[PDB]
Design an enzyme around this catalytic site. Sequence first.
Site, PDB file in Angstrom:
ATOM      1  N   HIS B  71       0.841  -1.288  -0.044  1.00 21.51           N
ATOM      2  CA  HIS B  71       0.102   0.035   0.022  1.00 21.51           C
ATOM      3  C   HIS B  71       0.840   1.192   0.068  1.00 21.51           C
ATOM      4  CE1 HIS B  71      -3.323  -2.898   1.328  1.00 21.51           C
ATOM      5  NE2 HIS B  71      -3.970  -2.204   0.196  1.00 21.51           N
ATOM      6  N   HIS B  75       1.493   1.305  -5.728  1.00 22.12           N
ATOM      7  CA  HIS B  75       0.210   1.079  -5.939  1.00 22.12           C
ATOM      8  C   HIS B  75      -0.583   2.268  -6.373  1.00 22.12           C
ATOM      9  CE1 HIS B  75      -3.630  -0.853  -4.638  1.00 22.12           C
ATOM     10  NE2 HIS B  75      -3.776   0.356  -4.001  1.00 22.12           N
ATOM     11  N   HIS B 109      -6.058   7.611  -2.937  1.00 23.90           N
ATOM     12  CA  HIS B 109      -6.854   6.551  -2.535  1.00 23.90           C
ATOM     13  C   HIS B 109      -6.308   5.861  -1.215  1.00 23.90           C
ATOM     14  CE1 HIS B 109      -5.301   2.850  -4.376  1.00 23.90           C
ATOM     15  NE2 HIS B 109      -6.082   2.253  -3.577  1.00 23.90           N
ATOM     16  N   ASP B 110      -5.038   5.590  -1.104  1.00 16.48           N
ATOM     17  CA  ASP B 110      -4.343   4.942   0.068  1.00 16.48           C
ATOM     18  C   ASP B 110      -3.601   5.831   1.071  1.00 16.48           C
ATOM     19  OD1 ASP B 110      -5.554   2.411   0.273  1.00 16.48           O
ATOM     20  OD2 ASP B 110      -4.713   1.288  -1.287  1.00 16.48           O
ATOM     21  N   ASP B 220      -8.402  -0.556  -8.351  1.00 15.28           N
ATOM     22  CA  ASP B 220      -7.623  -0.792  -6.973  1.00 15.28           C
ATOM     23  C   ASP B 220      -7.236  -2.366  -7.160  1.00 15.28           C
ATOM     24  OD1 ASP B 220      -6.429  -0.529  -4.428  1.00 15.28           O
ATOM     25  OD2 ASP B 220      -8.623  -0.964  -3.485  1.00 15.28           O
TER      26      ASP B 220
HETATM   27  O1  LIG Z   1      -4.449 -11.034  -4.012  1.00 19.91           O
HETATM   28  C1  LIG Z   1      -5.378 -10.888  -3.054  1.00 19.91           C
HETATM   29  C2  LIG Z   1      -5.542 -11.961  -1.852  1.00 19.91           C
HETATM   30  C3  LIG Z   1      -6.529 -11.438  -1.233  1.00 19.91           C
HETATM   31  N1  LIG Z   1      -6.917 -10.349  -1.028  1.00 19.91           N
HETATM   32  C4  LIG Z   1      -8.033 -10.069   0.014  1.00 19.91           C
HETATM   33  C5  LIG Z   1      -8.270  -8.787   0.439  1.00 19.91           C
HETATM   34  C6  LIG Z   1      -8.963  -8.238   1.266  1.00 19.91           C
HETATM   35  C7  LIG Z   1     -10.100  -9.265   1.624  1.00 19.91           C
HETATM   36  C8  LIG Z   1      -9.915 -10.479   1.087  1.00 19.91           C
HETATM   37  C9  LIG Z   1     -10.863 -11.468   1.519  1.00 19.91           C
HETATM   38  F1  LIG Z   1     -10.721 -12.746   0.897  1.00 19.91           F
HETATM   39  F2  LIG Z   1     -10.861 -11.867   2.899  1.00 19.91           F
HETATM   40  F3  LIG Z   1     -12.273 -11.107   1.481  1.00 19.91           F
HETATM   41  C10 LIG Z   1      -9.109 -10.835   0.271  1.00 19.91           C
HETATM   42  N2  LIG Z   1      -6.765  -9.196  -1.905  1.00 19.91           N
HETATM   43  C11 LIG Z   1      -5.673  -9.558  -2.821  1.00 19.91           C
HETATM   44  C12 LIG Z   1      -5.747  -8.598  -3.716  1.00 19.91           C
HETATM   45  C13 LIG Z   1      -5.302  -8.515  -5.269  1.00 19.91           C
HETATM   46  C14 LIG Z   1      -5.091  -7.249  -5.674  1.00 19.91           C
HETATM   47  N3  LIG Z   1      -5.545  -6.256  -4.658  1.00 19.91           N
HETATM   48  N4  LIG Z   1      -5.635  -7.003  -3.712  1.00 19.91           N
HETATM   49  C15 LIG Z   1      -5.638  -6.675  -2.465  1.00 19.91           C
HETATM   50  C16 LIG Z   1      -6.976  -6.026  -1.875  1.00 19.91           C
HETATM   51  C17 LIG Z   1      -7.181  -5.382  -0.933  1.00 19.91           C
HETATM   52  C18 LIG Z   1      -6.096  -5.386   0.099  1.00 19.91           C
HETATM   53  C19 LIG Z   1      -4.975  -5.713  -0.241  1.00 19.91           C
HETATM   54  C20 LIG Z   1      -4.620  -6.230  -1.311  1.00 19.91           C
HETATM   55 MG   LIG Z   2      -7.309   1.040   0.528  1.00 19.08          MG
HETATM   56 ZN   LIG Z   3      -5.697   0.445  -2.806  1.00 20.54          ZN
END
Ligand SMILES: O=c1ccn(-c2cccc(C(F)(F)F)c2)nc1-c1ccnn1-c1ccccc1
Ligand SMILES: [Mg+2]
Ligand SMILES: [Zn+2]
Lengths: 315, 315
Positions: B71, B75, B109-110, B220
């Site tokens: 973050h 990003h 945004h972050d 995002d």
């Molecule tokens: O590769 C990932 C694996 C898991 N999560 C994730 C994130 C939050 C909740 C959940 C939950 F599964 F719990 F819903 C899963 N996000 C990504 C990802 C791929 C691209 N951006 N982000 C991301 C999105 C949000 C935050 C960090 C990274």
């Molecule tokens: Mg965020």
């Molecule tokens: Zn973000």
Amino acid sequence: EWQGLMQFTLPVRLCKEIELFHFDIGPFENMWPGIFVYMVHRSCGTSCFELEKLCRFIMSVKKNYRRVPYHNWKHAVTVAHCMYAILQNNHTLFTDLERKGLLIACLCHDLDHRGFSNSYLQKFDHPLAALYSTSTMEQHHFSQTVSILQLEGHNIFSTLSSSEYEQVLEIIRKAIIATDLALYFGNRKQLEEMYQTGSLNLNNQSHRDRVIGLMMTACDLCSVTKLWPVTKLTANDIYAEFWAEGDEMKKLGIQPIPMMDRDKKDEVPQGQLGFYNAVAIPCYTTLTQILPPTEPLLKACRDNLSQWEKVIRGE
Amino acid sequence: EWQGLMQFTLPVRLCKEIELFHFDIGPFENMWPGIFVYMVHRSCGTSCFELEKLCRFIMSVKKNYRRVPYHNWKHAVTVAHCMYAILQNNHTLFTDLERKGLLIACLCHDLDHRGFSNSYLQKFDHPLAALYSTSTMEQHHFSQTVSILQLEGHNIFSTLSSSEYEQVLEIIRKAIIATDLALYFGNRKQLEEMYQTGSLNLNNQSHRDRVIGLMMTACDLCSVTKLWPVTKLTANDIYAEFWAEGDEMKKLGIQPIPMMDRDKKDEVPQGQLGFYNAVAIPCYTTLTQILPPTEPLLKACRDNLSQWEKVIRGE
Ligand SMILES: O=c1ccn(-c2cccc(C(F)(F)F)c2)nc1-c1ccnn1-c1ccccc1
Ligand SMILES: [Mg+2]
Ligand SMILES: [Zn+2]
Ligand SMILES: O=c1ccn(-c2cccc(C(F)(F)F)c2)nc1-c1ccnn1-c1ccccc1
Ligand SMILES: [Mg+2]
Ligand SMILES: [Zn+2]
């Protein structure tokens, strides 16, 4: 739109992967109608149905699956694809007529499902149970298939002789009936014995129908043969349907069985275990004995069983 | 520092590549501020913001991203670029005010992210959780945005009426909040129904708000939409940061969930396939339906999903 399906072309990369049992249609929603066309074309030939009628049939079949959590359009195509992979790996075991019928039947096997079991309808004197006393929904599904077939420009079996038209309806009918899990347990039991004694003979029609039965079960349950994260997600859709039914019962004063009781989620891991051991494993085991190239189905199933066992141990 | 940026000219050999959805900013670190300038100039015009204020703003934004694994400043620009590509490919749909706001929103945004999730902050009673009960980080992010705008020589919206200023801060605010993934699920679900019923009307402001939100979510997560070697490496940053949050919980001594647990390193592939299926795929699927030109995002996402399948299957 029903026309746009005619000019559909399956991407080259998908042409390779669609042949494997573990293939997952999930990320390709806009391609499902096209994927069925492709599968029918590879199994039965490009001049088997008239494309116009075939495309009109498929679109009408999609229209008549409901917006329920599990027994939806996605499920229909998932089940058709697994049949496809079974047929492709045992092609000359089955006749042209059978492959036609079984693929269409898989696509149609849950038509107009409402998210309720045979138990519910019968217990609560729904009119469908008054009409169909055993295998309630499955009989309705077959009735739904005939209705679609009889729509204007929808009769894909119009090129057939009367004799072959009847044969294929009967193939489809038994196939859809066979997806009543209530009938699976007996069927699998018989086949196991015939295999053990060495008495199973594919040229015996009743043996043949039994085999097809088992094939229909294997396809109906194949989402337990997909990679772990796919099966896990499907489990949510399945249980979302059960709980919705159990809630309907609680409103009507009567307590649902644990499987349908959203207040008994703790029991789910052990319920999956029971399902795999009592139903799914013995299903694909029997199938692999009869049709050895279906081995990957049993293999994947065993992987997912093993996963649920880790959940019960505490992971 | 901001002065060397006013001088910046994007090299011509990237004038076409930059327009591609799958463009990777990764090899061009010290060009990241200029790339933003460039994207703003092409989408809003060189007449939109005063060049001095715009340059000052970008550099303050940059410095207020922390040195965290995911973050961070990189990003911020990656997300801004995806927004750029969306807006470019839907030339007529969005207003001047919307385009100004959305690019600024993505870059901000972050802001001042600490590498911790909302539930972590609420769990351990962080002052920010005591301040913002829901969408905790997101409300802070916007707060940081307004702080930088209200610095001296930084108000890039100096040449807007009182009314437009209010509108554009509302556009930015809603867009930043929408990047709360918890709210994504509800939004996508509503939007699916609106497309399905055909009740989606972009004249309706609260329908625009929903659509903008989905675009926010799309941008995002857009690291799942790059070429395999780029997507595979960004995943390592994401999990590095998940694992640091878990480590902090394990320093305090509490059990994290498997995603954040680094004693679950091996399960990352499976964890990716699950996320693509439950979150990424439906996101770009619903976006593509609403905005057909954004189709290359979904296509890229599908390609990376099959790559993870191969990883899990040992191909
Ligand atoms: O590769 C990932 C694996 C898991 N999560 C994730 C994130 C939050 C909740 C959940 C939950 F599964 F719990 F819903 C899963 N996000 C990504 C990802 C791929 C691209 N951006 N982000 C991301 C999105 C949000 C935050 C960090 C990274
Ligand atoms: Mg965020
Ligand atoms: Zn973000
Ligand atoms: O994951 C499951 C847990 C329980 N059941 C189940 C269902 C009905 C009866 C029985 C009973 F054991 F009670 F006979 C068990 N089915 C599945 C399952 C896995 C794949 N398709 N289906 C499926 C099959 C049929 C209906 C819904 C889902
Ligand atoms: Mg059924
Ligand atoms: Zn079924």
